[PDB]
């Protein structure tokens, strides 16, 4: 019902948890992928300034 579409890009060499020195290669997942999630939280940040 007039849903919002979000463009997504996929990587295979990832650097999670600030890890400078170790990079992981995700092997190719064979087939078509589909997962349905519950977004339950957000992490926001103000811009501040002289307003």
């Amino acid at each position, epitope marked *: 019902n007039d849903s919002i579409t979000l463009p997504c890009r996929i990587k295979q060499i990832i650097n999670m948890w*600030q890890r400078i020195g170790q990079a992981m290669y995700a092997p190719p997942i064979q087939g078509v992928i589909r997962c349905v999630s519950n977004i339950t939280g957000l992490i926001l940040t103000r*811009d501040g300034g*002289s307003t």
Partner: antibody
Amino acid sequence: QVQLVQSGAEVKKPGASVKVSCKASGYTFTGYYMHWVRQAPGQGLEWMGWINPNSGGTNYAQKFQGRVTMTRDTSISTAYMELSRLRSDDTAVYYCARRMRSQDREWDFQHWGQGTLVTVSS
Amino acid sequence: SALTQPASVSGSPGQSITISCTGTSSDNYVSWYQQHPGKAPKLMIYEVSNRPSGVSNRFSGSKSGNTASLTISGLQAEEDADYYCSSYEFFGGGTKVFVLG
């Protein structure tokens, strides 16, 4: 022995761009945010925005939202401040500040750079 | 510029001086900076009263309500500079401290 070294004086045209360097030394560069404060000649301090060297996430002030782009280089431990479309009032000494080692929070700029002077020509 | 600082405060060599920083609203933690002309600012007082290392004990801070104050006892000839009070991201207009006769 926290050392903050900025770039040399810059002279740019109105509407052009200028990128200010800020090389850090004496601590872990990827553990503390990096702020940017400018000061017009004869005026007071003005906070522009902080950048987190970890992920690169910045926080530009609402006054410069859409003009300043803050990046960093973890390999050489140097943060950058680029201001696009320079106006006549942008002539100022641009400092890069860092929070205190203590108190586990920001907003206590103990370490400052020598400053970079930008001019408006005109 | 939500923090109001006096444009000029005078003092004589030896006596004490006081810089008041009145900020609108603001209900905790305040900071003070000293900037000599041609140099970068220097953190003198953080969190109202605490003092970093190694600024002289002659500098002390206080706050009551919407008014924070910086007290400098025993003024010298090198003490005169620009003084700014800080709250979160905001800065004051600045206070020029004079130590002339």
